[PDB]
Every structure is written in C-alpha cells, then in structure tokens.
A = this chain, B = another copy of it.
Amino acid sequence: NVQSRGLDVAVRNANDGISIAQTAEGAMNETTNILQRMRDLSLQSANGSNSKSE
C-alpha cells in the first residue's frame, strides 16, 4: 500500500515535470520564431541596395 501511494505521487511528480518542460519548450518555440525573423532581417540588411536609413 505504501508503494502504491508512492507510485501515485510519483506519477503526479512526473506529470508536473512534463508540464514544466512543456511550458519551457513553448517559450523556446516563440524564441526560435523571433530568432528566425531576426535572421531574415539581418539577411535583408546585408544587401548592397540598402542605405543607412533602411
């Protein structure tokens, strides 16, 4: 009985860890999107048709 209750609480703890990883990974997905947008901006800026204003 002690083992079964410990297994239940261990399942709860593992679910909490999965939740934390999911939240962090969603924030990381948004970070990746922003970084890709910045990469596109940097590639556009490197062209020779631009001047200081662009």
* Interface of A toward B, CB cutoff 8 Å: 1-2, 5-6, 8-10, 12-13, 16-17, 19-20, 36, 39-40, 43-44, 46-49
Contact = CB atoms under 8 A, between A and B. Distances in A.
Contacts of A49: 13, 16-17, 19-20
A40 B1 contact: no
Contacts of A44: 9, 12-13
A30 B29 CA distance: 50
A43 B8 CA distance: 10
B17 A47 contact: yes
Contacts of A20: 49
A16 to B, nearest CB: 4
